[PDB]
From a paper:
The anti-proliferative protein [name] belongs to the [name]/BTG family and plays important roles in cell proliferation, embryonic development, cellular differentiation, cancer suppression, and apoptosis. The anti-proliferative mechanism of [name] was revealed by its complex structure complex with [name] (Caf1), and was further shown to be dependent on [name] or CNOT8 but independent of other CCR4-NOT complex subunits. Two conserved regions of [name], termed Box A and Box B, mediate the largely hydrophobic interaction with [name] and are conserved in other family members, including BTG2. TobN138 consists of five α-helices and four β-strands that form two anti-parallel β-sheets.
To provide structural insight into fragment binding, crystals of human [name] residues 1–138 (termed TobN138 hereafter), containing Box A and B motifs, were soaked with a buffer containing several fragments. Structures of TobN138 with two inhibitors, corresponding to compounds 1 (i1) and 6 (i6), were determined to 2.3 Å resolution. The i6 complex structure revealed two inhibitor molecules from the electron density map. The first is located in the [name] interface close to Box A, where i6 is coordinated by Lys63 and Asp89 and stacks loosely against His59. Superposition of [name]-i6 and [name]-[name] structures shows that i6 largely overlaps with Tyr197 in [name]. Lys63 of [name] adopts an extended side chain conformation in the inhibitor-bound structure and would clash with Lys254 in [name]. Lack of sequence conservation in this site together with the low inhibition by i6 suggests it is dispensable for the [name] interaction, but could be useful for design of inhibitors targeting specific [name]/BTG family members. The second inhibitor stacks against the aromatic side chain of Phe97, located on the β2-β3 loop in the Box B motif, and is further stabilized by a hydrogen bond between the O9 atom and the side chain of Glu47, in the Box A motif. Glu47 and Phe97 are strictly conserved in the [name]/BTG family, but this binding site is distant from the [name] interface. The second inhibitor shows 43% inhibition and binds to a site close to Box A in the [name] interface; mutation of Lys63 in this site reduces the binding affinity between [name] and [name] to 47% of the wild-type.
Residue numbers in the entry: 0 to 115
The structure:
Amino acid sequence: HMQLEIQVALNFIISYLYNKLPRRRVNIFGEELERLLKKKYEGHWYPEKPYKGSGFRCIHIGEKVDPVIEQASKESGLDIDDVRGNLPQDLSVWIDPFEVSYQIGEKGPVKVLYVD
Ligand SMILES: CC(C)n1cnc2cc(C(=O)O)ccc21
Ligand SMILES: CC(C)n1cnc2cc(C(=O)O)ccc21
Ligand code: NA
């Protein structure tokens, strides 16, 4: 549910890290990110108001990097700048009941990864 959608979001994000960061530590990155997102999202997931807390759940990498990304970098031995450098600039990822979607660039459109 929430778990599945976190996975599609995770899969999307680390697809940018593979082949430029060490395979094994990227996996660990994925693993930590999943745990931290669950941990954060716990208590803030309302399937009947999909949009409630969405601004909260939003994973954003502007000129500021979302804390869960920083944390997952630390916990995987990965330089936070190497992680940033390999992900799209101005990335937003919205993980909401029934839909995960993302934007790239401040004037980018919103693209949908998963919806049901
Ligand atoms: C996205 C928003 C329109 N929304 C709010 N509650 C929902 C329940 C379902 C469902 O029955 O699967 C689908 C969409 C829903
Ligand atoms: C005003 C600006 C510097 N700023 C400070 N915290 C922020 C968080 C987000 C976010 O999570 O989307 C976006 C912008 C933020
Ligand atoms: Na390695």
